[PDB]
């Protein structure tokens, strides 16, 4: 999503 969303692997 936005810059603050989950940036890690899912």
């Amino acid at each position, epitope marked *: 999503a*936005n*810059p*603050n*969303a*989950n*940036p*890690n*692997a*899912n």
Partner: antibody
Amino acid sequence: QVQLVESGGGVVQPGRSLRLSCAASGFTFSNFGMHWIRQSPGKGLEWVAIIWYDGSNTYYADSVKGRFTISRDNSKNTLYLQMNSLRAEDTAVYYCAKVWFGESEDNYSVDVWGQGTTVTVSS
Amino acid sequence: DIQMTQSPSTLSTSVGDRVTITCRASQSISNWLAWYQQKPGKAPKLLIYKASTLESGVPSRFSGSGSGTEFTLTISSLQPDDFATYYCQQYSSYWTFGQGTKLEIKR
């Protein structure tokens, strides 16, 4: 545990370039997004850039947009910050930091910071 | 751009005191607020995220409270390791830090 070791800082003349690197260990580097954050006596703590775990998305602070490039090498477990067109006000201690693990709908920030590497932009 | 404000900038305090420092945001950031501790010459360290959740390893004398625009960090009984500078950080829209609050050794 988690450990982050920055390197590449030094004295650089205004207008020149510099490449910072951050060696990561103690966790699966390729699974996590990373930040660069800087600290100076004049501006305090100042977020610089973020990169997704796979390098797909990057975001930058307005003060460095167009001049800095964040990147990563997941085979080498290394985060990079290519700094171009450096100005005096970029003088700071530069930290890499690891994004924490959370739930799918959370907002995210950092849980582990590196030791920092000093950048001095001066003629 | 969300502005953050920390008060006070310096608090003179003593071992065993109950300490409360405040952080405020220019607009609503819900509970997306983190607290970082920094000792001189040392890297910052995460204390609290989601306004009130203690990071693992953080002693129980730390707590946080707040939602929306007003936030506080409380140390129920101050110990010598807590003499440091404390920063808040909103992470609702990008990332911006407060100016920091220094807990100073009263004498």
